Design a protein around this nucleic acid. Structure first.
Lengths: 125, 59
RNA sequence: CGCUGGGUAGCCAAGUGCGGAGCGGAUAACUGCUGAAAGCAUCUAAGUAGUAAGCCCACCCCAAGAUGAGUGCUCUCCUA
RNA sequence: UUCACAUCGACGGGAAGGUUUGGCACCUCGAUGUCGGCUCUUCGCCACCUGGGGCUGUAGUAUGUUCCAAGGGUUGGGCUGUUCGCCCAUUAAAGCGGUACGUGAGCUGGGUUCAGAACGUCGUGAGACAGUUCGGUCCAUAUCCGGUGUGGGCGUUAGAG
RNA sequence: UCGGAGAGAGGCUCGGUGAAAUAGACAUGUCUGUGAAGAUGCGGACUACCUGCACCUGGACAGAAAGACCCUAUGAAGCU
RNA sequence: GGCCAGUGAGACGAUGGGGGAUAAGCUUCAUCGUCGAGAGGGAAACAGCCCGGAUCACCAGCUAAGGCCCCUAAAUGACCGCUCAGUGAUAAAGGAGGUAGGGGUGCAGAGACAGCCAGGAGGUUUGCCUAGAAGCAGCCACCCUUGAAAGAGUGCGUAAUAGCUCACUGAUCGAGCGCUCUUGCGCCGAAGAUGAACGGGGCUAAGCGGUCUGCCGAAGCUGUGGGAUGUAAAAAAACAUCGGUAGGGGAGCGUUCCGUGUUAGGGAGAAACGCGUGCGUGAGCCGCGUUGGACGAAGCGGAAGCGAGAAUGUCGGCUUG
RNA sequence: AACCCAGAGCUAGCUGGUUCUCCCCGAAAUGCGUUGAGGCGCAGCAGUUGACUGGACAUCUAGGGGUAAAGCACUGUUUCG
RNA sequence: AGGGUGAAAAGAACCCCCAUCGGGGAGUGAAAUAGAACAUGAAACCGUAAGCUCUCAAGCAGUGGGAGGGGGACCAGACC
């Protein structure tokens, strides 16, 4: 298991989501049981000043529907970094996690928070 | 088998592929250590550590 | 209710009263400045400033059953 | 007037979209009820009105064309079974189209391929005619999916307010 | 045209008696696309605690009806 | 040649032609292949497209097609170059020095081009037409003179002029500039319907183009064992065939009864249910526990009204709303 | 133009259904006719049995028919001079 | 539509609960876990008890891999 810390600032995003989704699963350790969860509990510290490398930072995509008659509520990447910057990396790794109910557990093993801090000084970062 | 080793490759040093690894033994002359014999990774990882230094010497 | 007329409480209306807003962040079309490549010139390619009832937010109802099940205050149990 | 492109634009051309007119008639004649109206809406766009702009043979007040944008809103009647359309009278304007031309396991069922009858026409006749006219029973307490609302338990882990 | 209120027979709850159309099997969400080409069960993705009551009632080309429409089969039944 | 068939409204893709607009998985012919009577791997999901075409087992390897960031295994591997469009994951005529590579041409320190300053004259107010039109409605003409340069002449404008600007030339600064051709990757033109014409995330790279290596990757192939059919030699080696509908052909089990049986098994006991999950290619067989109450029947053959979960079946019983 | 019985279990190239198991091979949905084209008969294609160096792929030798292409003297069209 | 408890019925005195319907015992019989719904009495259907799984998880849901749990193992040997 163990806990590791990574800084998300210069990271162009995405390229890190595919490198972090392997730690929260054990794809880097002796993962000899795809049916059982394991791996390191690596968590992001910043993830707020994360880069993007591209013009999609103001016209990416990000869409969702609440099933309501209207919905369609669409938002630009520029808005994510403005509001709830904690779901800019999460939603990214989610689509990288296998299964549906099992891979979800691997998601609860990753925190991003604002940045330059983390209430996890009791797990030996 | 490939996934078992794959999870064991992202830690050693050959971040390339396990293919080159198999290529080493192929070009070498080791008809052993098959996909099934890859169980050396989990248990007694000391034996699977030797081949790690034998694959580099060959290629 | 035999017919017919009025009427308290409550319930409704042709009753009464009020909100549909303004002010912001960020933009579409367009208008802009300065100044490149094409020592002129030109909205930028590099740096900035304006911009609708759209979008976000602002008002209202629900809302951690959003099980990533939060926060704050207070109370009860310490017989073998 | 002059001047090609404010507006419009002959002889021809290239596409998008797709609700028109057709072909196909691929899946349904051990069947999926046609149109219209009424009730109640949903979405998109090349939105008619309100707002923000460019050009204007745009002085102003009012208009023409084009671009972004629909957030919202978007009529009561005479006649007909008609959508539509015409007419009278308003509104800022009083939009189009998809949703099996929204909607009959909701109403209406007025029109129209059910049986009656009559006129004209066609055949010697029985009858027939995408000609017209009168009258002419279309059911159902629904499990589930999907909704309008409200509960029964349990999980948030010491138990509750 | 905007209908509202009230009085009765049902509806709702409880007690007693006590049906049906129908049905291959169920742990039978939405949407886009796809698919003998308008499926929940395909693929991707989103959303979503388990299980009732009352009500509104679009989907399951729902139910009843091997359709009275057309055509096909040198079928049948009447009529002229 | 003889016995028994089945099937005659097939569909799709590539290719070569009639029909339709060379519009359709549309229709009608020929040819090949597939589906239809063979899965699987890949195109997200699509039988007919592609690879390969399944006797079987096996925590056994190597490959084809298609791919190698994650999600489902596999190169963010190496070298060079372009795109920086997210184009690639739909879409035309046409339009624009967005842009890389190669070749060539015109002007050019008797100094070109952009910019700045100045000139841009006279007859001809031309002819014709017109109410008038004197560069500038239209028609015809479109020569000449003075010069460094200036066409009876482009666009705006006036009722007609006037006026402004342009072609051209000189001076100044002053260095190479401008316009085509061949070719690669892209932009706008593309707006329609409950959010999604990359599978999702994501991505300027895991894009694309050129070269090279390895690997993932099918009941394919190889390897080993078992079952079935067929063929000569011979110290020796075994090769090949097995998807399958309708149909044809070749082998068997079980059920009732009968002959061989009042022989033998049974009250120290059929039938109904479980189990031993051993056995056969299979339908099943054998042994046995429990329950239960009577006969049943081993082997071969013979004679059968010979085993159905659907024909809106029939009879009876029993669920669901 | 009935009710009931009887021939009529009439007819029904229509439709639906059609009940154990293994092995081997393996179709077609085309032609010629048919008041015939959702029907079949004959032939082609399938299976079984009995006789035949009979065939197929490839190379070479040995001909014709004449599409594509091209041409377009001729037939039918065709602009400038 | 509807067949046969057993050889002979000895087809159930009496006793207990109830409205002197019904049942359980006491007895009879080799048997009534055979008694008048009665022989052998399966399946569909309808329940109790026990072990395991079961609220953040969805699609004719089985299959292959596969942890844990309730039992049975062998004087480990990793199995049903």
């Amino acid at each position: 298991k163990k806990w590791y810390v990574v800084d998300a600032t210069d990271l162009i995003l995405g390229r890190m989501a595919s490198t972090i989704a392997i730690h929260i699963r054990g794809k880097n350790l002796a993962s000899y049981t795809p049916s059982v969860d394991m791996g390191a509990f690596v968590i992001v510290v910043n993830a707020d000043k994360v880069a993007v490398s591209g013009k999609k930072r103001t016209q990416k995509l990000y869409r969702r529907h609440s099933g309501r008659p209207g919905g369609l509520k669409e938002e630009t990447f520029d808005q994510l970094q403005k509001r709830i910057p904690e779901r800019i990396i999460e939603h990214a790794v989610r689509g990288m996690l296998p299964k549906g109910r099992l891979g979800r557990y691997l998601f609860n093993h990753l925190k991003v928070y604002k940045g330059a801090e983390h209430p996890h000084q009791a797990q030996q970062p | 088998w490939i996934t078992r080793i794959n999870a064991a490759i992202r830690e050693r040093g050959v971040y390339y592929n396990y293919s080159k690894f198999i290529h080493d033994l192929y070009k070498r002359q080791l008809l052993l250590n098959r996909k099934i014999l890859a169980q050396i990774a989990i248990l007694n990882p000391n034996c699977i550590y030797m081949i790690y230094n034998e694959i580099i010497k060959k290629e």
